[PDB]
Amino acid sequence: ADTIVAVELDTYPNTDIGDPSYPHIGIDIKSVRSKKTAKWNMQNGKVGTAHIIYNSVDKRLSAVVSYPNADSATVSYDVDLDNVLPEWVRVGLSASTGLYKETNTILSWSFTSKLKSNSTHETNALHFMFNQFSKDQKDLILQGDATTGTDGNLELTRVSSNGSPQGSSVGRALFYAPVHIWESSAVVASFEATFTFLIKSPDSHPADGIAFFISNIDSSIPSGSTGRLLGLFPDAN
Ligand SMILES: [Ca+2]
Ligand SMILES: [Mn+2]
């Protein structure tokens, strides 16, 4: 039922459902089997940054993930969102752990969406920016194990009192207000999202990953979407 478009920062290779045999970033359109991926040199314990951009002229969804003094990974894919998503959506962040685990900490998150229409200066826009999360962040819909407040961060998956990440966890945070992502009379529709994150794992193999996603407004975590399904899809098709 849920329509999902996501950019995944996939830390664990599940080669049987299509993942490359290394940590990677990917663009997922309605399926966990990324339409395109790029090798990603994940760094256990360092704060990374992801930038996701899209505009309706090029109809190109792109993403870059980087770490200070290190190389960035980028991946792009041609997609006409007007054909995939409803015109009103919610945007959010999702992460999970399964048999293997890692912390999926979000330090900041900002988003900007703009619809420049056939009337010019008749632009509708939405922008939000979180550099700190409060214990009671009322403008975020928290699903599953996601929580805020710990040192002003958003922990998408369960982390015990001493900081150890737990397995079999899934959590998502969606911005409260629906977002008008496209409208047919719009000359140019575009958006940009940025978030900083901290993935740490005591394990040799961290899992499962973090994703930025856009979905139908009433999207909820699909049953059994812990692990490789990243809290976004009901199965691996
Ligand atoms: Ca994976
Ligand atoms: Mn993947």
Partners of 160 in beta bridges: none
Nearest of 122, 121, 113, 91 to residue 189 by alpha carbon: 113
Do residues 167 and 101 make contact, with C-beta atoms less than 8 angstroms apart? yes
Q: What is the CATH number of domain 1-237?
A: 2.60.120.200
Backbone angles phi, psi at 85, to 5 degrees: -105, 155
> Is 100 known to sit in a ligand binding site?
yes
Ligand 2 centre to CA of 10 (Å) is 5
**How far away, in angstroms, is 103 Cα from ligand 2 center?**
18
B/e letters for 61-91, b = 16+ CB within 10 Å, e = fewer, are bbbbbeeeeeebbebbbebebeeebebebbb
Instruction: Mention every residue, 6+ apart, whose C-beta is less than 8 A from residue 70.
Output: 41, 43, 46
**C-alpha 182 – ligand 1 centre gap (Å):** 30
Ligand number, closest to the Cα atom of 207: 1
228 annotated ligand binder? yes
Token representation of residue 64:
């870059």
Ligand located closest to 8 CA: 2
Distance from residue 202's CA to the centre of ligand 2 (Å): 21
| Nearest-angstrom CA–CA distance, 142 and 170 | 11
| 230 closest CA partner among 104, 140, 75 | 104
Among left, alpha and beta (phi > 0; psi -120 to 50; other), residue 121 is: left
First to last CA, the chain: 14
- In the chain the beta strands, taken as DSSP E runs, fall at 4-10, 24-29, 36-39, 47-55, 60-66, 73-78, 88-96, 105-117, 123-130, 140-144, 147-148, 154-155, 170-175, 179-180, 186-198, 209-216
State in Å: Cα 27 to ligand 2 middle. 9
Distance 149 CA to ligand 2 centre (A): 29
- Look at the block and give the residue holding tokens 């900041």: 108
The answer to whether 82 and 5 are in contact (CB under 8 A) is: no
The two three-digit tokens of residue 95, written as one number? 């992460």
Please tell me what resolution, in angstroms, this structure has: 1.9
Domain boundaries along the sequence of the chain = 1-237
CB count, 10 Å around CB of 161?
A: 5
Strand partners, 63: 52, 75
Cβ proximity of 56 and 188 under 8 Å: yes
14 annotated as ligand-binding: yes
Ligand 2 center to 44 CA (angstroms)? 18
Distance 59 CA to ligand 2 centre (A): 22
Amino acid at 79: V
- Retrieve residue 23's tokens: 């940590």
Q: Which two tokens stand for residue 168?
A: 């079999």
Closest C-alpha among 2, 186, 199 to residue 86: 2
As a residue count, the chain comes to 237
Ligand 2 centre to CA of 19 (Å) is 5
Q: Which residues pair with 90 in a beta bridge?
A: 215
Strands 154-155 and 170-175: unpaired
Contact, 75 vs 159, CB < 8 A? Answer: no
d(CA 184, CA 94): 29
3-state secondary structure 119-141: CCCCEEEEEEEECCCCCCCCCEE
d(CA 237, CA 233): 9
Question: Is 192 within any annotated ligand binding site?
Answer: no
